Amino acid sequence: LLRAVILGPPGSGKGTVCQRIAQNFGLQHLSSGHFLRENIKASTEVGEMAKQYIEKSLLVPDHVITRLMMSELENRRGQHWLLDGFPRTLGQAEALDKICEVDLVISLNIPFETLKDRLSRRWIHPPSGRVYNLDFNPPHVHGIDDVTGEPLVQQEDKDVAKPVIELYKSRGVLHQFSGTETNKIWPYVYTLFSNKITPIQSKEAYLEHHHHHH
């Protein structure tokens, strides 16, 4: 099974890329933010450990996230992985290597004009004030408010450690892209996934996601 990772700082278009990958290749969009939303909702020991930092709008320790990810991924060995925003540290990367063979790593960058606004991973629905922080409570659909279906606004005010890039660069599974509009990068990303997973709209099992069971 495919083990793919997508990395990049907020404002690099990682959200748009992951959504497009999920829809064209039928892969489940995984991230510590998604798993946390679940864990915090169910009130697991890990969710609790993380709750404390989240309430104060502080950072969750890298090891807490690691425990979370290793538990969740180990329970998903039987399916293709689209990992968004993880690993962020060498320690995390090493842990990941112990449970799988990473097939490809896409590294994204922020285009110049976008840096000036120093974007964060917080997306707000202005009409209600609902804030979706991609690290712990992402929306069902990227850039969209779960409740109203109305568009979100990414708020103003990195997560790509150099050694993690070097690590994958050495394995020769790294594919970096200069900060640029996402459409310029897309066909290249599409081809990379296409060489490993067949586009779901071209199959007999039309638009069927791999983890689907009727």
Residue 29 and residue 130 in contact, taking contact as beta carbons nearer than 8 Å: no
Cα-flanking dihedrals φ and ψ of residue 124, to 5°?
A: -110, 145
The answer to whether the CB of 65 falls within 8 A of the CB of 159 is no
Give the tokens for residue 74. 């180990």
Contact 87, 123 (CB under 8 A): no
Residue 37 burial class via C-beta count within 10 angstroms: exposed 0-12, middle 13-18, buried 19 and up: buried
* Helices 182-194 and 14-25, axial angle in degrees (round to 10): 40
Smallest CA-to-CA distance from 162 within 9, 44, 52 is with: 9
Residue 47, marked binder: no
Resolution in A: 2.3
Domain of 153? 1-214
What are the structure tokens assigned to 197, written together? 């997973």
105 - beta bridge partners? 5, 174
CB–CB of 155/123 below 8 Å? yes
Is 182 annotated in a binding site? The answer is yes
- Annotated ligand binding at 26? The verdict is no
131 is in an annotated binding site: yes
92 annotated as a binding-site residue: yes
153 annotated as ligand-binding: no
Angle between helices 90-97 and 162-171 (to 10 degrees): 30
- Name the pairing type of β-strands 3-7 and 81-84: parallel
Residue 25 labelled as part of a binding site: no
Q: Is 148 annotated as a binding residue?
A: no
Question: Known binder of ligand: residue 107?
Answer: no
Q: What is the DSSP string of the chain?
A: --EEEEE--TTSSHHHHHHHHHHHH---EE-HHHHHHHHHHHT-HHHHHHHHHHHTT-PPPHHHHHHHHHHHHHTTTTS-EEEES---SHHHHHHHHTT----EEEE----HHHHTT-EEEEEEETTTTEEEETTT---SSTTB-TTT-PBPEEEE---S-HHHHHHHHHHT-EEE--S--HHHHHHHHHHHHHTTS--GGGSSSTT--TT---
Phi, psi of 144, deg, nearest 5:
-130, 140
Non-local (6+) Cβ contacts of 140 within 8 A are 146
Using omega within 30 degrees of 0 as the cis cutoff, is the peptide bond preceding 87 cis? yes
Q: Are 106 and 173 in contact (CB under 8 A)?
A: no
Closest residue by Cα to residue 129 from 105, 145, 143: 145
* Residues ≥6 apart with Cβ < 8 Å to 89: 62, 161, 164
- 11 annotated among ligand-binding-site residues: yes
Residue the block writes with tokens 């993690």: 164
User: What six digits make up the tokens of 110?
Assistant: 């922020």
* 128 known member of a binding site: no
86 is in an annotated binding site: yes
Residue at 87: amino acid letter:
P
Is residue 132 marked as binding?
yes
Q: Is 138 within any annotated ligand binding site?
A: no
Q: Tell me: is residue 19 an annotated ligand-binding position.
A: no
Residue 4 backbone phi and psi in degrees, to 5: -120, 140
Position of tokens 């690290």? Answer: 135
Q: Structurally, how many domains does the chain consist of?
A: 1
The CATH number of residue 177's host domain is 3.40.50.300
DSSP string spanning 75-111? Answer: TTTTS-EEEES---SHHHHHHHHTT----EEEE----
User: Whole-angstrom Cα distance, residue 174 to residue 30?
Assistant: 19
Q: Are 106 and 192 in contact (CB under 8 A)?
A: yes
Does 120 count as an annotated binding residue?
A: no
The two three-digit tokens of residue 125, written as one number: 């629905």
